[PDB]
Structure 1
Amino acid sequence: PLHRYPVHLWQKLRLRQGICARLPAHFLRSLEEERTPTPVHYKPHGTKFKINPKNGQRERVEDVPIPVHYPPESQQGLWGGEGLILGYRYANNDKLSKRVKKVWKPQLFTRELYSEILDKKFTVTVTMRTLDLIDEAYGFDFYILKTPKEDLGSKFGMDLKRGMLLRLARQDPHLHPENPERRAAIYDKYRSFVIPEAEAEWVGLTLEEALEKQRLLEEKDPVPLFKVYVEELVQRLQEQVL
């Protein structure tokens, strides 16, 4: 036969049914929403018009994004949107020259950054672009919190964001231990990102982790039918007394 829904809608149906529906609304919104990462290696067409070939007249234009590969190591590091470009090159930037298989490597680094919220210095893989963003963000903690997941391009950074958001949300004394006065300043300094504790927990969680977490939340030990009947019997007897 023929499937009523196309294959791509199968993923949508799965998300709309089962434990996926029972997932927290705040987390579901974060997963559902998609934000484009900031372009770094390609620019969209400046002009919106160009000459159509067949008619020889001005026409609307379209944009072809350059392919950029972001390795999982970026998800374990803090890259500022830089990525590996895999493809072919024409030597000397002229079409008349030979085609050479080329892998374009942005300069990668491992560096240490201080987090005021976590009161710890983290040594992580980073690029020069990220370092400028951190300075522009007015602090490493700001960059993690301010930058969105796609622009951040780091699962660990999102995981760091999850920890930072929860730390801000709970006003946990873990921040700057033995310095309550200093702790308040950090919370006040990063007060903008204070959010409900429930939302902060699910920030950056992977789909497999989220499904297991929701399953663990909803898993409950079997009820002894003796207790269930006791509660039912008391309710009926209590109603009878009325």
Structure 2
Amino acid sequence: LGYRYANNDKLSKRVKKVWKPQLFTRELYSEILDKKFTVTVTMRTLDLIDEAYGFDFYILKTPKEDLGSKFGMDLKRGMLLRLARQDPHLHPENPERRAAIYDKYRSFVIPEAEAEWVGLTLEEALEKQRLLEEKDPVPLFKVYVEELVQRLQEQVL
């Protein structure tokens, strides 16, 4: 979103101009996910995928900023979690096929715990943490019982 000078001379009027990307919708197949997605994609991304020698390579290689998409980041977490867990759900009943994919992308393997917190926003991460730490209050009855038993046991000791 910017301005241009009519006839490309600064002595002419200043005119509003917006430059738009020639969006295209295509179908892409992810080996790690074994699913085909339909996505709005620019010709630039197609070249980047080709230079990355595969759609799956493109998602894993590209950092969070360069990717510039929340949908892409979710794919990054899904692929990373798939490789991290070595999930048998990938190409079931064909272990040979599954091993090939995992080995081909072995370089990007990272610990399972770290993979979970990939691409999440602050609110989504906050929600994830709150759920993990949610616990119903412990009845005081039990708490006092534990203290009483320990004191009695120690005294008998």
**What band does the TM-score fall into relative to the shorter chain?**
over 0.9
SS at match of 2:87: coil
Q: Identity of aligned pairs, percent?
A: 100
Distance 1:186 1:92 in 2: 55
5+ residue gaps, structure 2 = none
SS at match of 2:2: strand
The size of the alignment, in residue pairs, is: 157
Backbone CA RMSD of aligned residues = 1.2
1:94 CA displacement: 2.5
SS at match of 2:18: strand
Distance 1:94 1:175 in 2: 59
Distance 1:92 1:149 in 2: 39
User: What's the CA shift string for 1:4-62, capped at 9, x where partnerless?
Assistant: xxxxxxxxxxxxxxxxxxxxxxxxxxxxxxxxxxxxxxxxxxxxxxxxxxxxxxxxxxx
User: What's the CA shift string for 1:111-154, capped at 9, x where partnerless?
Assistant: 11110000011101111111111111111001000000111111
Distance 2:47 2:154 in 1: 71
With structure 1 as the length reference, what TM-score do the two structures score? 0.62
1:95 CA displacement: 1.9
User: What's the CA shift string for 1:70-93, capped at 9, x where partnerless?
Assistant: xxxxxxxxxxxxxxxx01111333
Q: Does residue 92 in structure 1 map to residue 92 in structure 2?
A: no
1:96 CA displacement: 3.0
1:238 CA displacement: 2.1
For residue 85 of structure 2, what is the aligned residue in structure 1?
Answer: 170
Find runs of 4+ consecutive structure 1 residues off by over 3 angstroms.
none
Distance 2:138 2:109 in 1: 39
For residue 107 of structure 2, what is the aligned residue in structure 1?
Answer: 192
5+ residue gaps, structure 1 = 1-85
1:206 CA displacement: 1.0
1:178 CA displacement: 2.3
Distance 1:237 1:180 in 2: 58
Alignment of 1:61-210 (within 5 A): 86-210=1-125
1:197 CA displacement: 1.1
1:241 CA displacement: 2.5
1:195 CA displacement: 0.9
With structure 2 as the length reference, what TM-score do the two structures score? 0.94
Q: From the two aligned structures, give the one with the greater helix fraction.
A: 2
